[PDB]
């Protein structure tokens, strides 16, 4: 239901899922032959099922086609520093694919939002839902669309008739946790013949 649902969330308030008291198999997520890009840092993509971890943190949101290269540790920009920062010790595993026939429609689908302005930087793994008007000048505006005051939250431009580098890409990241706790969720031993 995280992958296939009726609709998704935005980047300023994304879906947070915790996998506990479960068991899974990462072999069906590799032989799907339906994902566009697949990056998996910190661990090899084919030898992550044998090693066991404690918790799995999965976040799901939408992003454009030209910003899929920004989900990586060690760069600056507009989305990766104001919505979701990536730390240096990031052992996550990002999976992205194109589903332009469901999250977009004719006439202009503007249901998903994003944050453009921010006062300063933010700590990684932190959500920002502040809808306050970012003041640019030195005078207060008291919530008006006048001078030296602009709204940080802006709308998308998703259209299903676009090209390849600007389509709504369903991107998910699977991060692992390492603490003083036994193994909880982990791929077990494959049933051989």
């Amino acid at each position, epitope marked *: *239901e995280v992958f296939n*649902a*009726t*609709r998704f*969330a935005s980047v300023y*308030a994304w*879906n*947070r*899922k*915790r996998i*506990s008291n479960c068991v899974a198999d990462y072999s069906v997520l590799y032989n799907s032959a339906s994902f566009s890009t697949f990056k998996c840092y910190g661990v090899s993509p084919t030898k992550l099922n044998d090693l066991c971890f404690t918790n799995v943190y999965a976040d799901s949101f939408v992003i454009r086609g030209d910003e899929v290269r920004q989900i990586a540790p060690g760069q600056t920009g507009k989305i990766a520093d104001y919505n979701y920062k990536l730390p240096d010790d990031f052992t996550g595993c990002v999976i992205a694919w194109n589903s332009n026939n469901l999250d977009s429609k004719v006439g202009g689908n*503007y*249901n998903y*939002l994003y944050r453009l302005f921010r006062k300063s930087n*933010l700590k990684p*793994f*932190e*959500r*920002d*839902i*502040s*809808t*306050e*008007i970012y003041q640019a000048g030195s005078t207060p505006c*008291n*919530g*008006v*669309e006048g001078f030296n005051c602009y*709204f940080p*939250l*802006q*709308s998308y431009g998703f259209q299903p008739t676009n090209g390849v580098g600007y389509q709504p890409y369903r991107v998910v990241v699977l991060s692992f946790e390492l603490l003083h706790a036994p193994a909880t969720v982990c791929g077990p031993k494959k049933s051989t013949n």
Partner: antibody
Framework: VQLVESGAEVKKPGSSVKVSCKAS????????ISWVRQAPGQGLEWMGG????????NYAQKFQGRVTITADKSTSTAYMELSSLRSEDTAVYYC?????????????????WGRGTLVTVSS | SVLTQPPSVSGAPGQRVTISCTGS?????????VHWYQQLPGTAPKLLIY???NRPSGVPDRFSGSKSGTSASLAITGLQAEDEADYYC???????????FGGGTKLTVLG
């Protein structure tokens, strides 16, 4: 500030209801406005929240496409339209305000509420 | 729905009365903040405490909110003549794609 709503209103089982949300003063065209309902017998549900600046709708997956909420910038008011009423619509709606913040949680809170609109329907 | 609450709780006027809120590992245990409200039968509900760490203007300091892992707790000290209302859990649920409230507890002994 204070949000004033309409009083009691009754309709037919299968008609449309037209209530309003008035705001006294300002700070209405800058923050998100949602609608929280409450019925005697069960808990409190949440239909959706509407941003007045960009005019973007944001509903929940438990409510289907039968209710539409619009906003206005000339008089700073909000309207609620809901048709095809059922037998379990005897509840009260509230015009709430949202004030986001920063932190690890970042959950939507309702600091400012409305008065209340008793919308009952029967034969 | 996903959030359950006890139907009733007993207390004495002068001791500590605590309440417990249990849900799932995706709405309250995932990392989202909890919000407690008071539903008085005859007026509109207001805000009591947000984030379990700050104090709004106009609320007494007798309310204490904490999050112990996957469950949230609310503790009060002293029962005055205005606690005849209901307490709810509000937390952001990702499976429901929005905020969902709890069941609600009634706080009355015998009078």
């Amino acid at each position: 500030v204070q949000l004033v709503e309409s009083g009691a209103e009754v309709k037919k089982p299968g008609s449309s209801v037209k209530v309003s949300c008035k705001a006294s003063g300002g700070t209405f065209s800058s923050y998100a406005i949602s609608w929280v309902r409450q019925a005697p017998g069960q808990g409190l549900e949440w239909m959706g929240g509407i941003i007045p600046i960009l005019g973007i709708a944001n509903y929940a997956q438990k409510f289907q496409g039968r209710v539409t909420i619009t906003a206005d910038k000339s008089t700073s008011t909000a309207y609620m339209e809901l048709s095809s009423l059922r037998s379990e619509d005897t509840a009260v709606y509230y015009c709430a305000r949202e004030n986001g913040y920063s932190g690890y949680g970042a959950a939507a809170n309702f600091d400012l509420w409305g008065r209340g609109t008793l919308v009952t329907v029967s034969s | 729905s996903v959030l359950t609450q006890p139907p009733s709780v007993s207390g004495a006027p002068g001791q500590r009365v605590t309440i417990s809120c249990t849900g799932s590992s995706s709405n309250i245990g995932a990392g989202y903040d909890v919000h407690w409200y008071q539903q008085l039968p005859g007026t509109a509900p207001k805000l009591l405490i947000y984030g379990n760490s700050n104090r709004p203007s106009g609320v007494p300091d007798r309310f204490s909110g904490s999050k112990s892992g996957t469950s949230a707790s609310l503790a009060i000290t002293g029962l005055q003549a205005e606690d005849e209302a209901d307490y709810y859990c509000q937390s952001y649920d990702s499976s429901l794609s929005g905020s969902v409230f709890g069941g609600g507890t009634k706080l009355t002994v015998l009078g």
